[PDB]
């Protein structure tokens, strides 16, 4: 079972702001209850599934097109610039709403809304149903929000570990480095030896030769 | 003539001198094979210095190793 | 402004369910209007800050600690097993509540809520800000499970990159060990062949022995 | 006595003594020479192995440098 429960102005009540609590289940199409309050009475009217597939073939409308027509006009979900107007006769008590166009408008429904006898439980019905709601969406707040703050640590921890590959594979390549200079400049020393000694043996030599004759 | 003075004169230096060859080939022979030896000695420690500079690079790369096993623990899970 | 809007259960009126709205701003000390209602009528009353400060002296509690029992009575949040009675009487507008132990009644508050002319207009406003309020929840609602596919998105790119750089990596140390052996295999390959000249040379000298005497 | 003859004949003798050791001390000392060429060209040839050896190394870890500093764009943000 769900319910909606949206703000609309009546044009016979201009002033004011009522509410519609439209419940069904588990479609708009097989049925719904549908109720008007301003805070202190209370019309509720329910509506079956022949009443919406008649409302539609009157108008030659799609019933799908229909239906979906009613989600917008009564379930609050639709605009702008979906303009809807919204009457009700306290007298035949019943509920009028078109959807107005620059060039038509087109009557999409008539609901007899028939008075409550006790409209106080049904209102407080409805601020019990918010004030659960209300409590449903803060413990979902807490529970999301505590996931980020385990997912944004989650990615601190890599941040601060992937940090320290970076740093041990620098300090890798660096001693692989120094590792090639060292064994480098001894080969170095080694060939500046080899020079020296090719260059002792040419100098020897011509201290044998002038001795020597 | 004195026949026996020659032949045994002749037969002494011919003693003499395959004696003298024998001593040189035989020097040639160990001078050949102390450098086959050597070259091969060389060659042996230029295989030990080919193993220890490859086992020098898996000892320094263990730090890293062990880091990036341990971040690999963190992401797969 | 703030305000928190509460069930509570009156032993005046047991088989229904009230509501409390109360409303203050910044905090509960400095005062505080106070709302019940049945879904029907409602009566309303502000408790300055020198009324809870005198509620408070006359039971010679310390104000922090009494302000603090305010907040867990009429504000919801308390316990269990803080249990709470709620007396009201219609006649003289006084709206009571006491903390209720095994042993002692600490009798807390004695407000006095003087019939509103327009109950509807007040029930109205309530249910507009329970519907603004699940409106807004839900938009938190989106914007932090956003967060979370963006979050694991985010996570889900550096899984699969950082097992990229594994794969290299072991790629990597694998062709290292390839050409490590390689190499190795050469230098094995040519010790073999001086084994062999090693060898040759001394099967060609006694050849040369054999032969020459 | 022929005393040029012997002057002479012992002349010759010195001057071609002396000449066949001035060529030996010559070619014994281009042997030394040569050894020592040849030694400095193999150190020249083992210390361009070692480099060629560690460029070769760097050629290869290109591929995981470029993983690395990939993955380290994506999580310094």
């Known amino acids: ?213 | 003539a004195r026949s026996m003075e020659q032949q045994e004169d002749s037969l002494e230096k011919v003693i003499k001198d395959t004696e003298s060859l024998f001593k040189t080939r035989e020097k040639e022979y160990q001078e050949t094979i102390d450098q086959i030896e050597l070259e091969l000695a060389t060659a042996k420690n230029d295989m030990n210095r080919h193993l220890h500079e490859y086992m020098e690079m898996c000892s320094m790369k263990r730090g890293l190793d062990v880091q990036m096993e341990t971040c690999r623990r963190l992401i797969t899970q």
């Open chain 1, 1 to 213: 079972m769900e319910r909606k429960i949206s703000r609309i102005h009546l044009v016979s009540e201009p002033s004011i702001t009522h509410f519609l609590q439209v419940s069904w289940e588990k479609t708009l199409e097989s049925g719904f209850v549908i109720t008007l309050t301003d805070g202190h009475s209370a019309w509720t009217g329910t509506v079956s599934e022949s009443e919406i597939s008649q409302e539609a073939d009157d108008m030659a409308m799609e019933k799908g097109k229909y239906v979906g027509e009613l989600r917008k006009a009564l379930l609050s979900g639709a605009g702008p610039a979906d303009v809807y107007t919204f009457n009700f006769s306290k007298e035949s008590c019943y509920f009028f709403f078109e959807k107005n166009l620059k060039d038509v408008s087109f009557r999409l429904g008539s609901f007899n809304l028939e008075k409550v006898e006790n409209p106080a439980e049904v209102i407080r019905e409805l601020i019990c149903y918010c004030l659960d709601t209300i409590a449903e969406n803060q413990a979902k707040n807490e529970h999301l929000q505590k996931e980020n703050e385990r997912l944004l640590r989650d990615w601190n921890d890599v941040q601060g570990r992937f940090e320290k590959c970076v740093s041990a594979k620098e300090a890798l390549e660096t001693d692989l480095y120094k590792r090639f200079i060292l064994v480098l400049n001894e080969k170095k020393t080694k060939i500046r030896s080899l020079h020296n000694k090719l260059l002792n043996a040419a100098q020897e030599r011509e201290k044998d030769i002038k001795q020597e004759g």
